[PDB]
Design a protein around this ligand. Sequence first.
Ligand SMILES: *[C@@H]1O[C@H](CO)[C@@H](O)[C@H](O)[C@H]1NC(C)=O
Lengths: 49, 50
Amino acid sequence: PFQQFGRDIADTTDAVRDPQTLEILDITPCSFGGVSVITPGTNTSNQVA
Amino acid sequence: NGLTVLPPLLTDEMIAQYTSALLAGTITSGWTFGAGAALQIPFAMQMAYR
Ligand SMILES: *[C@@H]1O[C@H](CO)[C@@H](O)[C@H](O)[C@H]1NC(C)=O
C-alpha cells in the first residue's frame, strides 16, 4: 500500500504506481540496437540489406 | 542500459545436429569419417580395433 515504484536486480527502475489511480505500470526501455549493413562486394553489386 | 546481447550464429538446435552428426559418424564408421568419407563398419569390430 505504501510502495511508489519498483526496481530491477541492478538499481534500474522497472515499475511505477500511477499517483492518481493505484495502477502499477511496468517500464520497458526504448527499443535500440546496432544498424548493420549486409552487402555483396561493391565490385559485383550496389544493392544492400 | 546501452548494453546489448547478440545471438550465437549457430542455434542450440544446430549445435545439437552437429553433436548428432559427430556421434552418428563415430558409431557407424569409427575414425574413418575424420580421414575421408564415412566407411561403415560393424560396431563390435570398431571396438575390436580400439
Ligand atoms: C482521482 O480522481 C479520479 C477522477 O478524476 C478518480 O476516478 C480516482 O479514483 C481518484 N483517485 C484518488 C482517490 O486519488
